[PDB]
Homo-oligomer: A and B are copies of this chain.
Amino acid sequence: VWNNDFIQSFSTDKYKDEKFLKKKEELIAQVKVLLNTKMEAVKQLELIEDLRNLGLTYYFEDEFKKILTSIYNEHKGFKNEQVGDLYFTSLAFRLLRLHGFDVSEDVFNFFKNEDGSDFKASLGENTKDVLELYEASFLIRVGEVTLEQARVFSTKILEKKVEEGIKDEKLLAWIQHSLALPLHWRIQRLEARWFLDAYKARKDMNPIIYELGKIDFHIIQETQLQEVQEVSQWWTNTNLAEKLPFVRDRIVECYFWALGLFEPHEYGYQRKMAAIIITFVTIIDDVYDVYDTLDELQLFTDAIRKWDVESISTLPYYMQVCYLAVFTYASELAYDILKDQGFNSISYLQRSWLSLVEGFFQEAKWYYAGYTPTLAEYLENAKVSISSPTIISQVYFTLPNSTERTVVENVFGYHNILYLSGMILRLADDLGTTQKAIQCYMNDNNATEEEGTEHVKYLLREAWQEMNSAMADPDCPLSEDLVFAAANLGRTSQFIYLDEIHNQMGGLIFEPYV
């Protein structure tokens, strides 16, 4: 059992010695020599893809940018003319779009059938071509019909090939992984052991790149181990698990939701903060679940709305404990922001919590009234109750970001990226746990469980389409690192609920990579 004594028992000095940074730097230098060697464009893209799936982008941004800019410019910006065969087109399109380039789905028109209704059946002979097309299709943005055709075409083919039997077991395992969730829907850090193992098993793998990915795993793992030790001690010191007997003692789970949200080589403060915010979201939701009168929940909601010390006296003891704990944490977080960023954020932090509990209170109002929401009402609530806006809107102030009033009000709209993050998080949970979204659809429409399931799968893809468009909006008030965190909240839900999870969590956090 992952109690605090267990968590604190691990050493975090295994990789502190200066030889490890020196070895890592040497490996990085050697990989840059390779990235700078003349080679065919497709091989450059395959190298970038292998490094990026090992979580190594952080070390090679300049090299990636130079390689990709060259391929972009060699093919006139990927706007019309054919750029290569199906594999090269799919891989280059995917990597260019992921690195911020403006590319058109029209580059896929060369691979369609005569009427343009579908891709050419003959292109489906080659499994790896079809797989790359599949991966690219999930970068679809609003209005991009060709990438939806690509998704349907390539999914059907890959499912058929698994069905017929794929003798290459390593490729089979990779395809089953992408069929469960495409790479765009997964987080490299959460799966860092799987990606390292997959890479090592390839006959064409580069041992220097494997060695770099391994030592980076080792150092990242130990950095995150120290973080979860600090969050665990923080939690133990609050004594909340003892004072609130109805909350579950799950601090590792809360940290697991945080640890894949940010670029893993920095953002230590933000991972710990997200874990603590997620802890408070959970226990406040537990408070709304455990009380048995709407009037008591109204008192708690009103306390959060007033956000003052006087409200403590209006609450029963368990609610006093919960309220004062989150009130104290918000003041601590505001103090850190005031000291390090210079900015008075506490009014905004209060608004982040108020949105959350107004969402919980609305759910309770439905429950105590005996009202079942329509699916539209369910989702409108759930994107503010599920807590992505509450997390991301607070993390915003801990990073160098504009604090000008109108830009902050744009974040606190909430900006639709924050709602789309919550939407993906909610829908993935409802789909995996199979009243939730599917049941509301069935209720609304007198429809079958299969019909509701298919509709909610469509809603998840549509939310991703909208998120992809939102991430590309040049006027977005969120920087790329916070957009990545918002999307990663949805992806974490997809990993937990859409593919035991306790063993994967412990495997990533506490078990060595040999």
Contacts and interface: CB of A to CB of B under 8 A. Distances in A.
Interface of A: 238-239, 243, 307-310, 312-313, 317, 320-321, 324-325, 327-328, 331-332, 334-335, 338-339, 342, 344, 346-347, 350
A456 to B, nearest CB: 40
B313 A344 contact: yes
A284 to B, nearest CB: 16
Contact of A331 (B317, B331, B344): B331
8 contacts: A238-B335, A238-B339, A309-B346, A312-B346, A320-B344, A321-B338, A324-B331, A327-B331
Given A307-B309, A308-B308, A347-B310, A342 B325 contact: no
Contacts of A239: 339
Number of copies: 2
Contacts of A321: 335, 338-339
Contacts of A243: 339
Contacts of A350: 309
A487 to B, nearest CB: 31
A329 to B, nearest CB: 9
Contacts of A332: 328, 332
A324 B320 contact: no
Contacts of A339: 238-239, 243, 321
Main secondary structure of the interface of A (DSSP, over half): helix
Contact of A320 (B238, B308, B328, B338): B338
Contacts of A324: 331, 334-335, 338, 346
Name which of A238, A320, A342 has the most chain B CB atoms within 10 A of its CB.
A320
Contact of A309 (B238, B320, B325, B347): B347
A330 to B, nearest CB: 8
Contacts of A328: 328, 331-332, 334-335
A314 to B, nearest CB: 10
A351 to B, nearest CB: 12
Contacts of A334: 309, 324, 328
Contacts of A346: 309, 312, 324
A224 B313 CA distance: 36
